[PDB]
Amino acid sequence: WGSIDQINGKLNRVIEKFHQIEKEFSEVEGRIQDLEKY
Amino acid sequence: GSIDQINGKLNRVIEKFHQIEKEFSEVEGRIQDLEKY
Amino acid sequence: WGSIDQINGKLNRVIEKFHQIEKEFSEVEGRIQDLEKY
Numbered sequence: 001w002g003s004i005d006q007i008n009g010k011l012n013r014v015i016e017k018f019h020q021i022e023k024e025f026s027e028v029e030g031r032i033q034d035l036e037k038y
Numbered sequence: 039g040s041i042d043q044i045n046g047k048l049n050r051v052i053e054k055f056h057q058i059e060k061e062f063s064e065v066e067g068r069i070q071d072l073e074k075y
Numbered sequence: 076w077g078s079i080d081q082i083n084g085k086l087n088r089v090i091e092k093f094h095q096i097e098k099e100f101s102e103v104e105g106r107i108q109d110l111e112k113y
Contacts, residue, residue: 003079004040010086011047017093018054021100025061028100031107032068041079048082055089062096062103069106 076082 004044007044007079007082007086008047010083011044011051014051014086014090014093015047015054018051018058021058021097022061024100025058025065028065028104028107031111032065032072035072035107035110036068041077041082044079044082045076048076048086051086052089055093058093058096062100066099066103069103069110072110073106 076085
């Protein structure tokens with residue numbers, strides 16, 4: 001099992017990071033919207 | 039089955055990344071718009 | 076992909092790329108700050 005668990009671990013860490021950036025993106029898009037609007 | 043799920047999970051990761059790539063390109067273009075007009 | 080070596084190789088190439096997108100985003104975030112700052 002080791003190869004499989006090490007690749008799964010890494011893919012999961014990538015996926016968590018992607019989720020985190022999607023959140024940062026939403027907040028940034030909010031800020032853009034405020035600069036476009038006001 | 040393992041190489042199979044692995045493949046599956048990488049492909050999920052690769053699709054996410056492309057969307058990320060696309061979202062980033064869209065933000066930066068809005069930023070340009072504001073900076074130049 | 077056929078092998079763990081090759082999956083990890085491709086994952087690594089994503090991670091390298093993503094590394095670069097993060098730097099670009101941070102620079103963009105600073106640009107928003109500047110625009111907010113006015």
